[PDB]
Each structure stands twice: as C-alpha cells, then as structure tokens.
Short mmCIF file of C-alpha atoms (C1' of nucleotides) and ligand atoms in Angstrom, two decimals:
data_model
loop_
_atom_site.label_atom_id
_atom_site.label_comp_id
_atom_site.label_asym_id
_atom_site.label_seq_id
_atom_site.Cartn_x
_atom_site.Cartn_y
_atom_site.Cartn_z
CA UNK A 1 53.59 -84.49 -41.63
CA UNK A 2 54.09 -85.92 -45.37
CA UNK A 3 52.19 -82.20 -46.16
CA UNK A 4 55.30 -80.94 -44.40
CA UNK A 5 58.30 -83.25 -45.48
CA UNK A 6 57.59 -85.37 -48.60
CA UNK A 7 55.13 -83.91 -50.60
CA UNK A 8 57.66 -81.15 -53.18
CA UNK A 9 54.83 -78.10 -51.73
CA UNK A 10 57.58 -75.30 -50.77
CA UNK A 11 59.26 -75.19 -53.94
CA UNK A 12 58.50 -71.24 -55.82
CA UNK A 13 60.01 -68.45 -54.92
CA UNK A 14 59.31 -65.78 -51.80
CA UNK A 15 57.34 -64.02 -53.21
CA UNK A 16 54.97 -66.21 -54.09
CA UNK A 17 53.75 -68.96 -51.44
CA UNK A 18 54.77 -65.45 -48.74
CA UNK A 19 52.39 -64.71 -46.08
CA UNK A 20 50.68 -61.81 -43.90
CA UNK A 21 52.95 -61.09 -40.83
CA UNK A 22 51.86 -62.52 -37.47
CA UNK A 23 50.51 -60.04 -34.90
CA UNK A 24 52.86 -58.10 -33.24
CA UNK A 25 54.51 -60.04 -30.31
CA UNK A 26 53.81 -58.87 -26.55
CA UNK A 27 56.90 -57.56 -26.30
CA UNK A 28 56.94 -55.58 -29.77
CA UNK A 29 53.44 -54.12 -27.92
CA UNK A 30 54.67 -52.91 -24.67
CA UNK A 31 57.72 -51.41 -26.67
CA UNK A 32 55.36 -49.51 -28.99
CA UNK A 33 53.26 -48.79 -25.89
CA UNK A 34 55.91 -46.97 -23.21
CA UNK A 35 56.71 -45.00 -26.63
CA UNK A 36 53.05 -43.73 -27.41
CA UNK A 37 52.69 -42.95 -23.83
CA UNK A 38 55.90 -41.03 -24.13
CA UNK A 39 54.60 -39.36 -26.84
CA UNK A 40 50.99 -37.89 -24.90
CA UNK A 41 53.24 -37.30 -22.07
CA UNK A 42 56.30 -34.95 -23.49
CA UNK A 43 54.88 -34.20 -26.58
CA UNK A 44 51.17 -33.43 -25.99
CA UNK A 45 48.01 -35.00 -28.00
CA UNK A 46 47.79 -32.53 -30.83
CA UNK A 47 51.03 -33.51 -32.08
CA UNK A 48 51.84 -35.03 -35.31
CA UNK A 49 53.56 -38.15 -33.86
CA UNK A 50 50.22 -38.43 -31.73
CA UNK A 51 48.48 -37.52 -34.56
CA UNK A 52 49.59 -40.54 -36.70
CA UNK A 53 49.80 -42.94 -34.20
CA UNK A 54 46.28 -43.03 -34.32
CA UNK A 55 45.88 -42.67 -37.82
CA UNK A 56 48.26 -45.88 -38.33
CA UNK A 57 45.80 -47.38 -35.26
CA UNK A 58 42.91 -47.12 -36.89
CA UNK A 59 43.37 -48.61 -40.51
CA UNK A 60 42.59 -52.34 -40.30
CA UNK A 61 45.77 -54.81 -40.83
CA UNK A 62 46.21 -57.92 -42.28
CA UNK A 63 47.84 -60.96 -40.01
CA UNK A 64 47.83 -64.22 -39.75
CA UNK A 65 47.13 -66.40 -36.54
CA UNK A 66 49.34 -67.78 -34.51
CA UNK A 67 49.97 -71.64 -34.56
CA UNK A 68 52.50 -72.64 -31.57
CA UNK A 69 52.56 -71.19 -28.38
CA UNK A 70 54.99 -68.19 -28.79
"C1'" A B 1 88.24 -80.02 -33.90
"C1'" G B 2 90.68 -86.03 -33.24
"C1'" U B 3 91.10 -89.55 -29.07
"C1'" C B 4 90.47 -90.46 -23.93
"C1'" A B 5 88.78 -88.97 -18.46
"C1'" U B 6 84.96 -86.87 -15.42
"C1'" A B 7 79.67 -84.70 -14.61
"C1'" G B 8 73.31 -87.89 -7.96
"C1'" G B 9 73.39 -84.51 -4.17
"C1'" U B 10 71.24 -81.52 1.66
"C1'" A B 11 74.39 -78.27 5.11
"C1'" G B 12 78.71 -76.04 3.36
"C1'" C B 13 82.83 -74.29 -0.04
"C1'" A B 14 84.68 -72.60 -4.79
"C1'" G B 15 84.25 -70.76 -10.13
"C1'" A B 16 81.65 -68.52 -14.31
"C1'" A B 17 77.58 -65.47 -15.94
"C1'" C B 18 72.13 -62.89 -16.66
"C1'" G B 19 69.01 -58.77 -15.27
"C1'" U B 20 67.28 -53.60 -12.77
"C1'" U B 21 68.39 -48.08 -11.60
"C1'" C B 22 72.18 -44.24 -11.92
"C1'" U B 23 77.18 -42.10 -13.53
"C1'" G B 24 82.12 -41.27 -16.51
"C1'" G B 25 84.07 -41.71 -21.38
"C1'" A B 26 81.21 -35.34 -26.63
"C1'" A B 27 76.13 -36.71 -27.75
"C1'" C B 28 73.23 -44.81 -28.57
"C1'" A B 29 65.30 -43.73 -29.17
"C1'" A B 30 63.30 -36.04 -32.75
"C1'" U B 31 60.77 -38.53 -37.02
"C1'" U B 32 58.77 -45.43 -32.48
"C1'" A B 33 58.70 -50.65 -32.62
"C1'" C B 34 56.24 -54.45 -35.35
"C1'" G B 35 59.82 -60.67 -41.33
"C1'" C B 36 59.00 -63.92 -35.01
"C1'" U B 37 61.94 -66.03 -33.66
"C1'" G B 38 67.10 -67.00 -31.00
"C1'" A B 39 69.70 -69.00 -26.76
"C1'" A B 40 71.98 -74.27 -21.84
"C1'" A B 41 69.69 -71.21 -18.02
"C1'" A B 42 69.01 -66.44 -15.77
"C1'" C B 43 66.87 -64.15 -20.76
"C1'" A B 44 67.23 -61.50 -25.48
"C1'" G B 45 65.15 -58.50 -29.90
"C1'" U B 46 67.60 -49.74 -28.96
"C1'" A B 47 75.41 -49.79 -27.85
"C1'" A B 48 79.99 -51.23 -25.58
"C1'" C B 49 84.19 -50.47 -21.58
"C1'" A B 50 84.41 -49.36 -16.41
"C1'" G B 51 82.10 -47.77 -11.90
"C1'" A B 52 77.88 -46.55 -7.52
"C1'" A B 53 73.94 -49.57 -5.47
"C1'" U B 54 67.30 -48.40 -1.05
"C1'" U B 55 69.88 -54.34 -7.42
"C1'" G B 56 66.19 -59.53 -8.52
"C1'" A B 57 60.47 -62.10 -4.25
"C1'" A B 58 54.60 -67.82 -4.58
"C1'" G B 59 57.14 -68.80 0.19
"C1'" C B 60 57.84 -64.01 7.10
"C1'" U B 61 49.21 -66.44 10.56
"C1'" G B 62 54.11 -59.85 6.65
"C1'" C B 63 51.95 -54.38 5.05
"C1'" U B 64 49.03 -51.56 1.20
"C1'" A B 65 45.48 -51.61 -2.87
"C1'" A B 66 42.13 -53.98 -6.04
"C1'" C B 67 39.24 -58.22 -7.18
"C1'" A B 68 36.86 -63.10 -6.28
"C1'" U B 69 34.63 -67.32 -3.10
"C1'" A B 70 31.01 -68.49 0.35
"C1'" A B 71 26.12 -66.23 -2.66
"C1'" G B 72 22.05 -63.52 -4.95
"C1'" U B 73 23.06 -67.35 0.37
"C1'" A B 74 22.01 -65.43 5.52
"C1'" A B 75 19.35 -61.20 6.98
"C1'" C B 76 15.32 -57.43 5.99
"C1'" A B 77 10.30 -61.91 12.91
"C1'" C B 78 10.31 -57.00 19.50
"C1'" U B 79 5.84 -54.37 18.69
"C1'" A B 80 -0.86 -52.02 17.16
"C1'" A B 81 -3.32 -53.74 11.34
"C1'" A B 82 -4.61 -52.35 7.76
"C1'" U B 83 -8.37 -51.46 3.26
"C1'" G B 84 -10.29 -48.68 -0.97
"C1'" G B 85 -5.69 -48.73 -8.66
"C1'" A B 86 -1.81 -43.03 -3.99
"C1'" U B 87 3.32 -44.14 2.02
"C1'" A B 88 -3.83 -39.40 0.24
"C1'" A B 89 -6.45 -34.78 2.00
"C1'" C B 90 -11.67 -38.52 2.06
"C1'" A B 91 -14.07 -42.91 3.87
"C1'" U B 92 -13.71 -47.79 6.76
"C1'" G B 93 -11.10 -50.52 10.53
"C1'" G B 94 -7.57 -50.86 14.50
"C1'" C B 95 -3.49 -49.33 18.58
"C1'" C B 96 -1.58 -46.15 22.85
"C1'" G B 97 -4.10 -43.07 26.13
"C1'" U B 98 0.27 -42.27 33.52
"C1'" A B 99 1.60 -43.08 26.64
"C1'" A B 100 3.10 -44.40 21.49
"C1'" G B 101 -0.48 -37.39 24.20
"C1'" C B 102 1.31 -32.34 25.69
"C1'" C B 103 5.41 -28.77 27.97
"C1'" C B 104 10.48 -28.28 29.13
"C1'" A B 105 15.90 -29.62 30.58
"C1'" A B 106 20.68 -31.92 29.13
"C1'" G B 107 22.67 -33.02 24.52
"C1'" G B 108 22.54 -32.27 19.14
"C1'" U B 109 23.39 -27.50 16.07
"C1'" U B 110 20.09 -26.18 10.83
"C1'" U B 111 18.74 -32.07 11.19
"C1'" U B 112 13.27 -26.86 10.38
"C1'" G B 113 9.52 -24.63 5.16
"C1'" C B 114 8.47 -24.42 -0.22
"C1'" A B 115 8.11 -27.65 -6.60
"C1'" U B 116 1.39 -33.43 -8.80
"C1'" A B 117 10.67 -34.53 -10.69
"C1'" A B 118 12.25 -30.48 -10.37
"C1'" C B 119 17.04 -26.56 -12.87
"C1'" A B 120 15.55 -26.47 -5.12
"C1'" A B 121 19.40 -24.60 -2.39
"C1'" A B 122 21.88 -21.08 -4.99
"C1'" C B 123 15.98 -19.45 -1.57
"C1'" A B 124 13.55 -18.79 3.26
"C1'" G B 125 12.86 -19.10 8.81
"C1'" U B 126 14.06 -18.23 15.54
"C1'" G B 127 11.20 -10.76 16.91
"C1'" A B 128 11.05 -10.28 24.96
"C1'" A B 129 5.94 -5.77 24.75
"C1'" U B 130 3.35 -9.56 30.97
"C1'" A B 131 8.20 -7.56 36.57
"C1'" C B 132 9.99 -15.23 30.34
"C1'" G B 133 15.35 -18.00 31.65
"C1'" G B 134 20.31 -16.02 32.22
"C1'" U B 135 23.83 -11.98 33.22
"C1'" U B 136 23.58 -9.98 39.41
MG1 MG C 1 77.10 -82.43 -9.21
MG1 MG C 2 77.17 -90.53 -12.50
MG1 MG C 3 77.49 -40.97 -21.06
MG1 MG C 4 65.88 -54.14 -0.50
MG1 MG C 5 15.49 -63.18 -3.32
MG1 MG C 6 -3.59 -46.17 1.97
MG1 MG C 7 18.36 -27.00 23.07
#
RNA sequence: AGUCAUAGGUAGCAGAACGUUCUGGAACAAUUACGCUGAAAACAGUAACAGAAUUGAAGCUGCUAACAUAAGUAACACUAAAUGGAUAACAUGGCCGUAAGCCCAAGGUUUUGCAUAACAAACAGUGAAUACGGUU
C-alpha cells in the first residue's frame, strides 16, 4: 500500500516503467474467433488471411498476468 | 449546479431503459480484433434514426444431447473337472449315455470352409441317378 501511494515509484515517463499488454480479454477472443472461422468458412484455408492468421498464431507473445479478477 | 422535500415492500398499477434476429434510409467488418478497462443495473468495447418480431430462461417429477456420481462398486455361483509352459492333434482323468448321442420338422436364412495375425472376404460351398419331399 505505501509501495502504491507514498513511496515517489511512478514518477518517469511512459515509456519507461511501460509494460507487456495483458492477454487478450475473453471477449477480444471470441471476437477474433467468429472472424477466423469466417475466414475457413467463406474464404477457404489456402487463403492469405488464413494463411497469416496462423502465422501471427504461432510466433510466441509477450504478456503479462493478470492481477484482479477481470 | 445552490438550498430544501421524498426514496421498506408481496399481489397489483404506472414511468424510464438494456439486449437478440430481420428490414427501410446508396453501401457501417475485403485487408479482423487484441493499451483493459467503463457504466447504477440490464451490459458495453464494429454506426445512428425508425420499423417487424417464432425477442431474453436455474426454476413446468418439461423434451433432446453430452458428461459425471454411486464405482472400478455390484455382477461375471444352475450344471460334469480338469492336468501336462497351447481353449492342442498326443497322453492322463472325469461327465451324459432314453442324453449333453444320431436323423428330421417348424423357425432362422449364409450364421457353413480356408491363413502357426493375416492384406481373408474381395474367395469358396448346397449336384435327385433308387419309383427322396413337394407340385397332382
Ligand atoms: Mg420503494
Ligand atoms: Mg425510509
Ligand atoms: Mg440498410
Ligand atoms: Mg418463444
Ligand atoms: Mg477387480
Ligand atoms: Mg489343455
Ligand atoms: Mg430348414
């Protein structure tokens, strides 16, 4: 609590003391979801949308954990 | 934008809104979204204005589907009996023997034969010639 309010800790700029993003909410997930699906359904899995869906799926990501319960 | 007044509720009555699907206003997601939070709630984060509704579900011993629990529990006790490193051909022992043997009928309709795994059902098999049963 004094590591949150008293202590001067949050003090530089954005760029430094920024983060990695949190993982992408559940919401964000069934969006991207219903869209991929759309994608293999209308637009076929040799596609380039297809194509680089997977490509973005596969590289690794850097996140943080979530803290709270949201 | 400063003072006051009111705000427990079942049945019931009244008022304001959220969300789902579709349509009109030319087209509001081709190449996505993803700072993770905001809001009093229903919720929001891919328009808005109107309209048409098979428009909102823990709650009907409701229906359908999937998955648990009981639980690796109960069961695998009607019988003759098995043994040799094999559901053995060989050897030993046992059981039925008015049957648990043999020949047919009704019914079934290929359930019938072949490979020391295998790639095998995709392959075979039912012969009227004794005055056999039927058909008359
Ligand atoms: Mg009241
Ligand atoms: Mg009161
Ligand atoms: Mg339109
Ligand atoms: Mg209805
Ligand atoms: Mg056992
Ligand atoms: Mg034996
Ligand atoms: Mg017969």
């Amino acid at each position: 609590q004094l590591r949150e309010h008293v202590e001067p800790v949050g003090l530089e700029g954005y760029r430094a003391n920024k983060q990695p993003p949190l993982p992408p909410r559940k919401y964000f997930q069934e969006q991207s979801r219903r869209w991929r699906a759309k994608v293999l359904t209308e637009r076929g899995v040799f596609s380039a949308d297809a194509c680089r869906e997977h490509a973005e799926a596969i590289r690794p990501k850097s996140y943080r954990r979530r803290t709270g319960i949201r």
